[PDB]
Each structure stands twice: as C-alpha cells, then as structure tokens.
C-alpha cells in the first residue's frame, strides 16, 4: 500500500542536530516530490521543505532556511532531513508527505507519514514526583468521591497512569500533560462513588521509561 | 505565503447534518486551495484538491466550493468518523501555507461540572510547592471560567488548566486547574477558593 515511516525524533539540546528520514514504499518514490511539514502543537501546520523527483530542486520555509537540507536516495527509497543549530521552535512532530502529481504546478500532500517528533530543551531527562490527590470521607458530592494521582515534573513526555483496571467507577480522567516553566506535569483522577473510600484501596500506576516506575496511594 | 484565515475554530455539530467550514486566502490564489482532516490521532488525510477535486477514497460526502480568495468544505451528512479537524492550505506560491483548523465537537445538552478542590499534601509540601487543583468534572459545553481566590484575592497568573477533549461515550469534557505557590506562599494565606462561572447554573460554585 502507499507508505511512509518516519525515523530518528528524539531530545535534542538547542545547538544540535538531528537527521530524520522517510522509508517510501508503495510508490516509484522516483516520481515524486517530497515534502516535510511541521506540527508544532500550540502553533499548526507549517511547510518546512521540498526536493524535487531527483533533487535538482528545492525550497526551504524561510524559517529552517540555511539550517535544515533535504536530500533523498532514490534507489534507496529514502527522503531525509538534516536539521543544525536546533532552536527551542523547531520542536515539532515531522511529516513527510509526497506531492501530489496531478495539477500542473499545485502544491499538495496525497499521502503521509504517521510523524517523528523532535523536541529542544536543554531539560534532562527526569522521572516524575507522584503525590496522591485525596477526597475527604463521604466526599465532595455527597454520594460520590473524587481522588487523583498529582504526577508532576518529569522530562520527556510520556507518563502512562492506570489504576482500576476492571469495571465500574473505572472513570478515569488523565488530563493532557501541561509544560511547567521546564518540565511536564499531569494529573489522573477518577471519580468513584464515597462508600469505596476507607473500605478499599486504589493505587494510582505511574511510569516513565526515561526511568521511573512509581505505583502509589 | 497568503495568510490563511478559518475564521472558526470549532463548530458544535450533530450527526447527520450538514457542515460548511471555510477558509480565505489574504491573495487569490486562483482555485489551488486543498483540504485535509486530521483524526483525532494525528494522523492527517488529504480530502480535496484543487478546490473541489476529491481524492480517491474520500466519500462524495465532501464537497470543496470556491471564488478566488473565498473558499468551502462542506460534510453534506456529518457521519461519527468525520469528527476531527479540517485545515486548508494554498499550494500557488512558496512558503504554502495552512489554516488554522476547524475541529468538530459533539452537540448535547448542558451539562454542568460537578467541581472538586483538592488541598496539596505531604511530600510536596516537605519539598517546598503547594499544588492546590480544582476539577471540574464531566460538563458540556467547554466553557467554564475558574477563578482562584487566595484569601478573597483575586489569583492572576499561577494556574494552569487541562481539558479533557469530548468524551467518546456521553460527549463532555473534564477540567483542572492547579495553583502552584510555595510552602511560605502556602502558608502565609489560609483560605484557598476555586471559584467556577459555568452555563450549568447562573451560579458559580466554590
């Protein structure tokens, strides 16, 4: 089928550099013209930067202009990105998407890749800090409890939390990671009804493999 | 390098109607305008070209209208594997460039956000920061309005919030935000408020 496998994001520090590349395969990657685009979450879409079926041309967004290069192996089916003096900004995830070939001269992406991301942060890798969320006996909405795992500042993304796995008040609610100034902070709670608390236990399973493991409540 | 406008960033929508999402190119950009839908995965498709072009596989469901810097999508029948976001882009002249997005949400009734406070605890204290967390619990639509009161006082810049995005059952959102201080911040104040303006009552809560 049409494909595109994106490899080598990863942590980079500002200064630094980084290579992805793009595996084609379903497609005579020798007729079409490769592109990379961005989504820097926050920010959208951006067009980073084209080669041409066998690159004799190519286009830079003014903003990766003179650090990045785009390149490819036709017999190796390979698109590649080589990226220098890495920004903060250029923490993206990376699509490679091919053009399109058919409108004369209209630029569009009819397939692509499922993303490498790359994040620039001088942050060093760090397993989080876990701190229990607590209810209050036959808690906060008369009938029903509420408690929480705090998973706060950890580096990279991501934390994976669990809890319950079973039936029945399984209401768990990871809210989306928040960057503090540096580092990364989530919360799980679920919501099970006040006659659970003090008659049984939940514990709340973090873990992060830039190391830490930590199950707790 | 048009600047590309979606004027709407999320339509409250219902399955089985009729979406019209639209984009305006600063320049024309004489009918190279394409369209895309990103899954709520990431993962991004290509719908339309050329305007109205339809790309193989993509249902007749989708239609692309346009005049020159006015462009449209429009879903005749919404179907539940059409919630996602929906961007533009003109692919004339370098750099090409995208909207912003028109991203899909589920129409349903008013729901209000049963709201818990959650006080830090030992550990962190012992480390110094207070986290105190307010959560605002399965409500529709998504906008609520916390504000955190330290002693009456009016918090401006230490909360940050998260949002649950719609839930793939029953359709509503969760949020929390989280007031980080210090431990001498902490404790030079003793009453901590969350104070929540939701169209669940014309009431806040706390």
């Known amino acids: 089928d049409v494909q595109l496998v994106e490899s080598g994001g990863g942590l980079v520090q500002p200064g630094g550099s980084r290579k992805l590349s793009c595996a084609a395969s379903?497609?005579?990657?020798?007729?079409?013209?490769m592109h990379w685009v961005r989504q820097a979450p926050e920010k959208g879409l951006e067009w980073v930067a084209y080669?041409?079926?066998?690159?004799?041309?190519?286009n830079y967004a003014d903003t990766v202009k003179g650090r990045f290069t785009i390149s490819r192996d036709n017999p190796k089916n390979t698109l590649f990105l080589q990226m220098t003096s890495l920004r903060s900004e250029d923490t993206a995830i990376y699509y490679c998407?091919?053009?399109?070939?058919?409108?004369?001269?209209?630029?569009?992406?009819?397939?692509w890749g499922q993303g490498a991301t790359l994040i620039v942060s001088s942050a060093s890798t760090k397993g989080p800090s876990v701190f229990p969320l607590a209810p209050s006996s036959k808690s906060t909405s008369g009938g029903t409890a509420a408690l929480g795992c705090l998973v706060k500042d950890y580096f990279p993304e991501p934390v994976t939390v669990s809890w319950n796995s079973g039936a029945l008040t399984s209401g768990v609610h990871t809210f989306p990671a928040v960057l503090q100034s540096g580092l990364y902070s989530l919360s799980s709670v679920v919501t099970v009804p006040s006659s659970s608390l003090g008659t049984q236990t939940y514990i709340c399973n973090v873990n992060h493999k830039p190391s830490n493991t930590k199950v707790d409540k | 390098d048009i600047q590309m406008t979606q004027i709407t960033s999320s339509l409250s929508v219902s399955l089985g109607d009729r979406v019209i999402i639209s984009c305006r190119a600063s320049?024309?950009?004489?009918?190279?305008l394409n369209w895309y839908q990103q899954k709520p995965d990431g993962s991004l498709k290509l719908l339309i070209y050329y305007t109205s072009r339809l790309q193989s596989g993509v249902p007749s469901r989708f239609s692309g209208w346009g005049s020159g810097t006015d462009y449209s999508l429009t879903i005749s029948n919404l179907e539940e594997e059409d919630i996602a976001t929906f961007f533009c882009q003109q692919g004339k002249t370098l750099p090409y460039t995208f909207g912003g997005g028109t991203k899909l949400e589920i129409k349903r009734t008013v729901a209000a956000p049963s709201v818990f406070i959650f006080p830090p605890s030992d550990e962190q204290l012992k480390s110094g920061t207070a986290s105190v967390v307010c959560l605002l619990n399965n409500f529709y639509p998504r906008e609520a309005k916390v504000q955190w009161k330290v002693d009456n006082a009016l918090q401006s810049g230490n909360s940050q919030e998260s949002v649950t995005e719609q839930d793939s059952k029953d359709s509503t959102y969760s949020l929390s935000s989280t007031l980080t201080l210090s431990k001498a911040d902490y404790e030079k104040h003793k009453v901590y408020a969350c104070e929540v303006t939701h169209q669940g009552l014309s009431s806040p809560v706390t």
């Open positions: 379903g497609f005579t990657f020798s007729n079409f013209g």
């Open positions: 320049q024309d950009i004489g009918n190279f």
């Open positions: 998407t091919r053009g399109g070939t058919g409108t004369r001269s209209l630029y569009y992406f009819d397939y």
């Open positions: 080669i041409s079926s066998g690159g004799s041309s190519i």
